[PDB]
């Protein structure tokens, strides 16, 4: 058994961490007080769920998690919420004054003042690990803390834990729920600084989650709670292989091995189905073939884009519920005879499949309906570069006039960092073009 | 279209179906951070000089 | 009020479409880099499809199908026909064609014709040389191209003993309905066809530009080298005792349906975050047995001068006002 | 990012500040004795932004009252909420400033500014995490204009990393007390350009026009003008005073609103304009209407760099989003294309007093240059003949200072023009 440490940075990261750990407790039968009746080894053990929970002698199962925010109002909600008993104070780190949606303020001005405290609190969790495999880092692209402090933390984690894998869950900015005009600046800056330090990053475009909630959950104006419950379902689908028995994606290194043949092209596209409203009393249970077909419809993707006009480098199907391999293979055959699924020619045209028999868990009183089977497809497709193109275009539009640049220079950053990060993004888009498009 | 590496357990099973064959150092980081801090201090000193 | 942008200033069709949209009083043109549009009349090359459909509160529509280039490039079309099971190498309305880069398959079939005394004339073109000897074509290429069986027995209009090609305009809307404009056009040669001299490329190439320069009889039989469907149907009746519909138009509709339905799964915007339509120009040949052959598909076609008004009005009716409604006798035949 | 320190200087500053405190004390359920009597915890969740908590359950505004003559502050102390202010936070002299920026900035005000700063320091020292300061003042008089800008300079020297926010009333010949108001305002604008992060330009011309044309008030008083000012101030501080995601503190507001450091002068607006049921389309349409702007500028004469919209009341957030997207999409020419998604929208459930729904508008428009051009023309008309300068040279100022202030304000106008044309 090898431990994973989760790090939640900024508002988006912390609230998504709340949702994820609530869902984990429900999936593993851990009560809000940390007790887990089905765990018959008191005070220890090396079960799969111990990858994410440590155990006290009193029988409490404690998340291997650190929460970091530069202002205290969001983490105070963890301290006062349902699962407060789950966490010890040393896991919850707050400052007094946030990064004001400023990458430079998060990375330099304040980050330099809190980075050592954060690293010490992470070290304390690492010292409880017999074989730490790495970190899962949850953060927004757009916020000052989520971008700048995350980039700083990733650099320091590369220094202090060189041999350890680092995965990201990154919230891509969307104007319908965004709070800052400079979010494209922050996104490109943190992507440039983090690119060398992340082995695999799962981008979640708030636009996609928002529209999925509106369309499939019939929520007229989704809130962060709706978005985070959906995002936590997807995150749980991704980490279930680390948290349960199974042969596929069982350590962080396997994510990179299976999904990322080239280190820089490490942003898999996630697609999830089915998303069904709890309000909808009569509901037709979708078959394996139907939900597998839904994985290739952009309307179900975590990032809106068109894989038909890109190329695949890897594809994993993660089923939960009543699913058998024969039905999986039948569905794949049918879909292949009907869809534009083109792989790069130096890669096999194949699917790596895992099935967990436990159907997805949903939060009681939530918006998601309980379904008999669901699937999350993680495919590494060049089409995801459409999001980089969008972000870089907005960046270019603002930076041609140096709009808002003085806010970043004022925190000790140099203007050259903008153009350096943008050139790194241009090289990334060019890499995606080379791997994905024919002449 | 072949199925390979089928592993089964009590909680699920995995396999693979094929349809067709084919870092900066701590010192450098502290240096960056201190350079930014010094540029901040210089801008603030310039402001205080102007106000004086 | 609906909003649109114009990013191809060199398109006559969509210049007229922009004019019509403005003259309705319910469409307002923005600067070309304004993202808050309902409609994009986009550029021919590197249209930023990846940036469409990400504007909240805006239903966004573009006048091009991403991926339709597969149908509208010579080599791409050859490869698509040969490798698509829906079309297959056994396809009977596309001339034998091969993609050659600056081969062995081409020479193999060519040798079958050589030691078979058969008509062995081929044409080489790209995105032109007509020869009966393969070495000359292959040498011409090296100085990506397609080599294609040259139809040595074309249908010849009389009087004049002259060659022609047929241009059909086809509109595919956001629902992937296929509309064939009821008005086609025949681009005619004004010089008598000469099966003994492919050296002179004026009685062999029916292009309007080529005629209007190298043909000394340009404009003799019709204006300018354009015969429209009423006169061509009357000619077919008088001369060959058949109608245009029976002898040619059925095959034309079949071919259009075949190609567009073949590529539908790859370009359809049915469940996409933005929507597409596109106008296509299909170019057909007719041999002396009244068999129709597909020559090429144009992704950004022009129109016959006297048909611009009707066709562009039909565009704004079928493709644009269907998505953005304003406050029978359809000019299109719906193919299904 | 928690506590804000409030300062009100001069006659106009203290009158509009007293009305502001009355309004937001009602909104937060605080009675004139400092006791809370509301019915919703939303009223208390961020009460510490503007109020200290005192012995018992008393809430005392973090407010400092400054003037160079006692009259207006005696009237505040006798006003409805007069007893709510901390007695030690009244800092006044006796000489007055005689509508003279030089007296406010260099002589009379210089004699009082240190005790004002002492009170500022005492308030800041008991702040968990000071965000910065908001100042209410006029630019046409002497104390507000000159001594407020002096106070801003001193506070910037002592707190260089804190946000400076002002509510600045621009003089207008339509509602004028003296002919030297263009001098005082031009001298003040230079200081604000250098030493504030955000300035709400409240143009008395616009307030008069609204009271007369729209509210059908034949003879508008300063009370009637200050009704609009207090409603607008409550609107623009809603995101600071109530829980929310967008522009929830002064620095985030500045980062969202200020693309270039000098262009930080905001045009506020309010809907509905009052002295019985608005739909969201009506709220949006009116809030973008020039006749609802508190700066006498035609926005259709310039371009929006950034916009913040705040809707208050119980309404369909779906419909709010639809209507804001509608306004942007159908008038996109008036929003600069080189700042994508420059309109941000907040919704607060708690409406102001007397209304079921309202909307407050904060625009950083290049059309604000019309206000500064108007002030510059009125300045030059007197300055070219050196009229009324002796009031200022008698206080130690030299003409070169006026020439330089004129130059800088002309530069500000030229910068707005550059970005209007970009
Ligand atoms: N899906 C989702 N997105 C969120 C959530 N909270 C914030 N965001 C998004 O994240 C971006 C804002 O970044 P934040 O995480 O709020 O900022 P931060 O990390 O706290 O950094 P600072 O507040 O500037 O110190 C915007 O695009 C928001 O839409 C959340 O709970 N769920
Ligand atoms: N197998 C073939 N047999 C007989 N004629 C042929 C032929 N292939 C092409 N042609 C002739 O070539 C002429 C046009 O050539 P082509 O098909 O390349 O279009 P084009 O390149 O001139 C227009 P564009 O490329 O812009 O769409 C036609 O008039 C046609 O008669
Ligand atoms: N909206 C409003 N404007 C005022 C008020 N009092 C003065 N003004 C204006 O402010 C200018 C005079 O400033 P004033 O505050 O009286 O001088 P000070 O006391 O020395 O700062 C003139 O332009 C007045 O019109 C007021 O109560 N409300
Ligand atoms: Ca155990
Ligand atoms: Ca006065
Ligand atoms: Ca004295
Ligand atoms: Cl290590
Ligand atoms: Mg935050
Ligand atoms: Mg052609």
- Dihedrals φ, ψ of B21, to 5°? -75, 170
State which fold the A269-383 domain adopts. 60s Ribosomal Protein L30; Chain: A; (3.30.1330)
Same domain? C182 vs C311: yes
To the question of whether residue D11 is assigned a binding role by annotation, the answer is yes
Binding pocket residue ranges, ligand 1, CB within 6 Å:
A 10-12, 15-16, 70, 98-101, 140, 142-146, 171, 173, 177-179, 183, 206, 224, 227-228, 231
Does the structural domain A1-268 have CATH classification 3.30.70.2860?
Answer: no
Q: Determine which helix (DSSP H) or strand (DSSP E) holds B6, and give its type and residue range.
A: strand B2-9
> Which of D340, D343, D363 is the best mutation test for A, with the most CBs of A within 10 A?
D340
CB-proximal residues (5 Å) to ion ligand 5: D 11
Reported structure resolution in angstroms: 3.0
**Any idea what the CATH number is for the domain that residue C226 is in?**
3.30.470.20
D409 Cβ neighbours under 8 A, 6+ residues apart: D186, D189, D190, D193, D372, D375, D376, D379
Question: B30 CA to chain D: closest CA distance, Å?
Answer: 23
Cα D64 off chain centre by: 16
Do C211 and C239 fall into the same domain? Answer: yes
Crossing angle of helices A224-243 and A10-28, in 10° steps, is 60
Q: Are B37 and A272 in contact (CB under 8 A)?
A: no
Residue D144 among known ligand-binding residues? yes
- Phi and psi angles of residue C206, each rounded to the nearest 5 degrees, phi first: -90, 10
Task: Name the minimum distance, in Å, from the CA of D334 to any CA of chain C.
Answer: 11
Atom of ligand 3 nearest to the CA of D97: 20
Q: Which residues contact C147 (CB under 8 A, 6 or more apart)?
A: C97, C98, C100, C106, C122, C123, C124, C137, C141
Is C54 in the A-facing interface, judged by CB distances under 8 Å?
A: yes
**Count of other CB atoms within 10 angstroms of residue D355:** 15
Q: For A223, name the nearest residue in chain D, comparing CA atoms only.
A: D317
Domain termination residue (choose one: C152, C167, C191): C152
If one counts the domains in chain C, the total is: 3
| Ligand 3 pocket residue status of D175, Cβ below 6 Å | yes
Which residues of A are marked as active site? 254
- The response to whether residue D93 sits with its C-beta less than 6 Å from ligand 3 reads no
Question: Which has the closest alpha carbon to A332: A376, A373, A293, A287?
Answer: A293
Chains in touch with D (3+ beta-carbon pairs under 8 Å) read A, B, C
In chain D, whose CA is at the least distance from the CA of A174? D341
> In this structure, are C113 and C249 located in the same domain?
no
Domain boundary pick from C16, C48, C63: C63
User: How far apart are the C-alpha atoms of C273 and C52, rounded to whole Å?
Assistant: 8
Please give the helix or strand (H or E) that residue C166 lies within, else none: strand C162-172
Nearest-atom number in ligand 1 for the CA of A98 is: 25
| C67 lies within 8 A of chain A by CB | yes
The residue contributing the CA closest to ligand 1 atom 30 is A12
**Chain B to chain D Cβ contacts (< 8 Å):** 9
CATH number at residue C49: 3.40.50.11480
How many angstroms separate the CA atoms of A268 and C246, rounded? 54
| Spacing, Cα D143 to ligand 5 middle (Å) | 9
Closest C-alpha to ligand 1, atom 10: A140
Q: How far apart are CA A89 and CA A97, in angstroms?
A: 19
Q: Whose CA is nearest to atom 23 of ligand 3?
A: D171
**Measured CA angle at D133 (ends D128, D135), to 5 deg:** 150
- Going by alpha carbons, the residue nearest to atom 29 of ligand 2 is C206
Number of neighbouring beta carbons within 10 Å of residue C119:
14
Q: Which CATH number fits domain A384-439: 3.90.226.10, 1.10.287.600, 3.40.50.360, 3.90.550.10?
A: 1.10.287.600
Regarding whether C319 and C176 lie in a shared domain, the answer is yes
Q: Which residues contact D390 (CB under 8 A, 6 or more apart)?
A: none
Q: Do D and C make contact, counting contact as 3+ CB pairs within 8 angstroms?
A: yes
What distance in Å separates residue D28's CA from the closest CA in chain A?
Answer: 20
Q: How far is the CA of D69 from the centre of ligand 6 (A)?
A: 12
Residues C116 and C188 in one domain: no
> Which are the contacts of D119, defined by CB distance < 8 A and separation ≥ 6?
D64, D88, D89, D91
Regarding the beta carbon of D8 and ligand 3, being less than 6 Å apart is answered no
Determine whether the interchain pair A350/B36 forms a contact, defined as Cβ–Cβ distance below 8 Å. no
User: C82: Cβ below 6 Å to ligand 2?
Assistant: no
Are residues C209 and C322 both part of a single domain? yes
Q: Residue C131 is part of which domain span? A: 96-152
Query: Scanning the structure block, which residue is given the tokens 């992507």?
Result: A191
Residues C241 and C204 both lie in one domain: yes
Q: Is C184 in the same domain as C245? A: yes
Q: Could you give the residue range(s) of every CATH 3.30.1330.20 domain in chain A?
A: 269-383
**D162–B contact, CB cutoff 8 A:** no
Residues of D in contact with C34 (CB under 8 A): 332-333, 337
Evaluate the omega torsion of the peptide bond into residue C159 and state whether it is cis, within 30 degrees of 0: yes
Domains recognised in chain D with CATH numbers: 1-259 (3.40.50.1440), 260-367 (3.30.1330.20), 368-422 (1.10.287.600)
Q: How far, CA to CA in Å, does D12 sit from each of C30, C109, D65?
A: 45, 96, 12
Q: Which residues are found with C-beta within 5 Å of the ion, ligand 8?
A: A 11, 98
Residue B17 to chain A, least CA–CA distance (Å): 5
Chain C residue nearest residue D331, CA to CA: C36
| Buried-state track C55-92, b at ≥16 Cβ within 10 A, e below 16 | bbebebbbbbbbbbbbbbbbbbbbebbeebeebeeeee
Question: Which H or E run contains B5?
Answer: strand B2-9
Q: Residues D45-75, buried b or exposed e (16+ Cβ, 10 A)?
A: ebbbbbbbeeeeeebbbbbbbbbbbeebbee
Say yes or no: C324 and C257 in one domain. yes
Q: What's the token pair of residue A413?
A: 């950053």
Distance from CA of A195 to the nearest CA of D (A): 25
D142 is in an annotated binding site: yes
The ranges of chain A annotated as CATH 3.40.50.1440 are: 1-268
d(CA D343, CA A411) in angstroms, rounded, equals: 25
What is A218-235 written as a DSSP string?
--SS--HHHHHHHHHHHH
Closest residue on chain D to B50 (Cα): D157
CA atoms within 13 A on the CB side of C74: 19
Instruction: Specify whether C250 is located in the same domain as C132.
Output: no
* Ligand 3, atom nearest to D204 Cα: 1
- By CB neighbour count within 10 A (0-12 exposed, 13-18 middle, 19+ buried), where does C13 fall? buried
Long-range contacts (CB closer than 8 Å, 24 or more residues apart) made by B39-48: B39/A412, B39/A414, B40/A108, B40/A109, B40/A410, B40/A411, B40/A412, B43/A410, B44/D160, B44/D161, B47/D156, B47/D160, B48/D157, B48/D160
Q: Is the CB of C256 under 6 A from ligand 2?
A: no
Q: Which of A12, A96, A173, A210 to mutate to test the pocket of ligand 1 (most atoms within 8 A of CB)?
A: A12
**Closest ligand 2 atom number to CA of residue C122:** 1
Report the atom number in ligand 2 closest to the C-alpha of C298.
Answer: 27
Paired tokens of C127? 């995105």
Q: Is D12 in the pocket of ligand 3 (CB under 6 A)?
A: yes
Most informative mutation of C74, C119, C296, C301 for ligand 2 (most atoms within 8 A of CB): C296
Contact (Cβ atoms closer than 8 angstroms) between residue D226 and residue D170: no
What is the Cα–Cα distance from A345 to D217, expressed in whole angstroms? 78
Name the β-bridge partners of C276.
Answer: C62
Chain A residues touching B5 at Cβ < 8 A: 247
Cα distance between residue D192 and residue A100, in whole Å: 22
B48 to D153: CB separation less than 8 angstroms, yes or no: no
Do C70 and C137 lie in one domain? The reply is no
3-state secondary structure chain D: CCEEEEEEEHHHHHHHHHHHHHHHHHHCCECCCCEECCCCHHHCCCHHHCEEECCCCEEEECEEEEECCCHHHHHHHHCCCHHHCCHHHEEECCCCCCCCHHHHHCCHHHHHHHHHHHHHHHHHHCCCCEEEEEEEEECCCCHHHHHHHHHHHHHHHHCCCCEEEEEEEECECCECCCCCHHHHHHHHHHHHHHHCCEEEEEEHHHHHHHHHHHCCCCCCCHHHHHHHHHHHHHHHCHHHHCCCCCCCCHHHHHHHHCCCCCCCEEEEEEECCCCCCCCHHHHHHHHCCHHHECCCCCHHHCCEEEEEEEEEECCCHHHHHHHHHHHHHHCHHHECCCCCCCEEEEEECCCCCCCCEEEEEEEEEHHHHHHHHHHHHHHHHHHCCCCCCHHHHCCCCCHHHHHHHHHHHHHHHHHHHHHHHC
Residue span(s) of chain A under CATH 1.10.287.600 come to 384-439
Q: How far apart are CA A240 and CA A44, in angstroms?
A: 21
* C75 at A interface, C-beta within 8 A: no
* D339 to A403: CB separation less than 8 angstroms, yes or no: yes
C139 and C90 in a common domain: no
| Burial status of residue C29 (CB atoms within 10 A of its CB: 0-12, 13-18, 19 or more) | middle
């Amino acid at each position: 058994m090898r431990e994973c440490i989760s790090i939640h940075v900024g508002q988006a990261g912390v609230q998504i961490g709340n949702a994820c750990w609530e869902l984990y407790c429900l999936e593993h039968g851990i009560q809000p007080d940390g007790q887990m009746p089905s765990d018959k080894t008191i005070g220890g053990g090396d079960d799969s769920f111990n990858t994410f929970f440590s155990e006290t002698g009193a029988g409490k199962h404690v998340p291997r998690a650190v929460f970091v925010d530069l202002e205290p109002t969001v983490i105070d909600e963890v301290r006062t919420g349902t699962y407060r008993q789950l966490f010890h104070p040393e896991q919850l780190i707050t400052g007094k004054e946030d990064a004001a949606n400023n990458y430079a303020r998060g990375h330099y001005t304040i980050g330099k003042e809190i980075i050592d405290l954060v690293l010490d609190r992470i070290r304390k969790l690492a010292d409880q690990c017999t074989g730490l495999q790495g970190f899962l880092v949850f953060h927004s692209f757009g916020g000052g803390t989520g971008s700048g402090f995350t980039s700083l933390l990733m650099e320091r984690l590369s220094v202090d834990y060189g041999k350890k894998s680092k995965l990201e869950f990154s919230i891509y900015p969307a104007p319908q729920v965004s709070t800052a005009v400079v979010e494209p600046y922050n996104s490109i800056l943190t992507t440039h600084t983090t690119l060398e330090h992340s082995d695999c990053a799962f981008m979640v475009d708030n636009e996609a989650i928002y529209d999925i909630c509106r369309r499939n959950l019939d929520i007229e104006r989704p809130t962060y709670t709706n978005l985070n419950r959906l995002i936590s379902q997807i995150v749980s689908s991704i980490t279930a292989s680390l948290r349960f028995d199974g042969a596929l994606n069982v350590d962080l290194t396997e994510f990179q091995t299976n999904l990322v043949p080239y280190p820089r092209i490490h942003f898999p596209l996630a697609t999830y189905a089915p998303v069904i409203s709890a309000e909808k009393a009569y509901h037709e249970q979708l078959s394996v073939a139907e939900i597998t077909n839904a994985c290739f419809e952009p309307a179900n993707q975590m990032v809106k884009c068109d894989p038909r006009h890109g190329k695949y480098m890897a594809c994993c199907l993660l089923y939960r519920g009543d699913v058998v391999p024969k039905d999986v293979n039948a569905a794949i055959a049918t879909i292949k005879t009907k869809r534009s699924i083109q792989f790069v020619d130096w890669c096999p045209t194949g699917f790596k499949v895992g099935i967990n028999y436990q159907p997805p868990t949903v939060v009681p009183g939530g918006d998601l309906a309980k379904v008999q089977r669901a699937v999350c497809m993680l495919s590494n497709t060049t089409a995801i570069a459409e999001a980089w193109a969008r972000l870089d275009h907005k960046f270019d539009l603002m930076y041609a006039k140096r709009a808002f640049v003085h806010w970043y220079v004022g925190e000790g950053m140099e203007e050259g960092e903008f153009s350096e990060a943008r050139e790194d993004m241009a090289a990334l888009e060019k890499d995606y073009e080379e791997v994905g498009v024919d002449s | 279209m072949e199925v390979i590496e089928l592993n089964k357990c009590t909680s699920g099973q995995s396999f693979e179906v094929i349809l067709k064959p084919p870092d900066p150092s701590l010192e450098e980081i502290q240096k960056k951070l201190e350079a930014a801090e010094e540029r901040r201090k210089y801008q603030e000193a310039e402001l205080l000089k102007h106000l004086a | 009020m609906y909003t649109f942008v114009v990013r191809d200033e060199n398109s006559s069709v969509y210049a007229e479409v922009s004019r019509l949209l403005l003259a309705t009083g319910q469409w307002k043109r923005l600067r070309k880099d304004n993202p808050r549009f309902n409609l994009m009349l986009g550029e021919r090359n590197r249209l930023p499809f990846g940036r469409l459909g990400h504007e909240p509160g805006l239903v966004q529509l573009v006048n091009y199908y991403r991926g339709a280039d597969k149908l509208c490039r010579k080599a791409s079309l050859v490869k698509l026909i040969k490798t698509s099971p829906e079309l297959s190498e056994s396809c009977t309305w596309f001339p034998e064609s091969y993609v050659i880069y600056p081969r062995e398959v081409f020479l193999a079939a060519y040798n079958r014709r050589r030691e078979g005394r058969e008509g062995n004339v081929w044409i080489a073109k790209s995105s032109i040389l007509i020869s009966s000897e393969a070495s000359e074509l292959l040498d011409f290429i090296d100085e990506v191209h397609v080599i294609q069986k040259y139809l040595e027995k074309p249908l010849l209009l009389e009087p004049g003993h002259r060659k022609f090609d047929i241009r059909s305009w086809v509109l595919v809307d956001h629902l992937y309905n296929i509309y064939l404009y009821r008005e086609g056009v025949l681009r005619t040669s004004s010089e008598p066809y000469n099966s003994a001299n492919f050296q002179d490329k004026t009685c062999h190439l029916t292009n309007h530009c080529i005629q209007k320069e190298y043909s000394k009889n340009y404009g003799r039989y019709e204006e300018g080298n354009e015969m429209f469907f009423e006169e061509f149907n009357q000619y077919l009746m008088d001369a060959l005792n058949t109608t245009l519909e029976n002898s040619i138009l059925l095959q034309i509709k079949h071919i259009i349906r075949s190609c567009l339905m073949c590529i539908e799964p790859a370009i359809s915007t049915k469940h996409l975050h933005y929507q597409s339509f596109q106008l296509f120009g299909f170019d057909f040949m007719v041999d002396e047995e009244l068999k129709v052959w597909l020559i090429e598909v144009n992704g950004a076609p022009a129109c016959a001068q006297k048909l611009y008004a009707e066709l562009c009005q039909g565009i704004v009716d079928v493709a644009i006002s269907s998505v953005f409604p304003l406050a029978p006798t359809s000019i299109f035949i719906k193919l299904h | 990012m928690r506590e804000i320190v409030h300062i009100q200087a001069g006659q106009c500053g203290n009158q509009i500040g007293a009305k502001f405190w009355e309004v937001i004390s009602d909104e937060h359920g605080i009675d004139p004795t400092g006791s809370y009597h509301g019915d919703s915890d939303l009223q208390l969740e961020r009460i510490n932004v503007y109020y200290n908590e005192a012995t018992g359950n008393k809430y005392v505004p973090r407010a400092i009252l400054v003037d160079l003559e006692p009259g207006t502050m005696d009237s505040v102390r006798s006003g409805p909420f007069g007893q709510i202010f901390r007695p030690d936070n009244f800092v006044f002299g006796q000489s007055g400033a005689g509508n003279n920026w030089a007296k406010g900035h260099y002589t009379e005000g210089a004699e009082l500014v240190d005790s004002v700063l002492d009170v500022v320091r005492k308030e800041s020292e008991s702040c968990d995490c000071l965000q910065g300061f908001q100042l209410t003042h006029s630019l046409g008089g002497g104390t507000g204009s000159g001594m407020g800008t002096l106070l801003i300079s001193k506070i910037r020297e002592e707190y260089p990393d804190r946000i400076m926010n002002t509510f600045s009333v621009m003089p207008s010949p339509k509602v004028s007390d003296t002919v030297v108001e263009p001098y005082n305002a031009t001298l003040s604008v230079h200081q604000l350009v250098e030493n504030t992060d955000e300035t709400y330009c409240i143009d008395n011309e616009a307030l008069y026009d609204i009271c007369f044309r729209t509210l059908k008030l034949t003879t508008p008083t300063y009370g009637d003008l200050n009704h609009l000012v207090s409603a607008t101030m409550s609107g623009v501080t809603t995101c600071l005073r109530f829980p929310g995601q967008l522009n929830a503190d002064l620095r985030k507001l500045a980062v969202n609103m200020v693309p270039f450091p000098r262009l930080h002068f905001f045009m506020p607006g309010f809907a509905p304009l009052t002295s019985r049921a608005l739909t969201v389309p009506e709220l949006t349409q009116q809030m973008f209407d020039s006749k609802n702007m508190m700066a006498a500028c035609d926005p259709r004469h310039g371009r929006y760099l950034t916009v913040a919209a705040i809707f208050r009341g119980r309404m369909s957030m779906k419909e709010v989003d639809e209507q804001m997207l509608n306004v942007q999409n159908k008038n996109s020419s008036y929003f600069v294309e080189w700042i994508p998604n420059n309109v941000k929208t907040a919704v607060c459930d708690i409406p102001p007093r007397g209304l079921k729904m309202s909307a407050t508008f904060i625009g950083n428009s290049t059309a604000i240059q019309e206000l500064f051009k108007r002030i510059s023309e009125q300045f030059t008309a007197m300055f070219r003949r050196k009229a009324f300068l002796h009031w200022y040279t008698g206080e130690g100022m030299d003409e070169m200072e006026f020439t330089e202030a004129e130059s800088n304000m002309n530069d500000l106008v030229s910068e707005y023009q550059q970005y209007q044309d970009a």
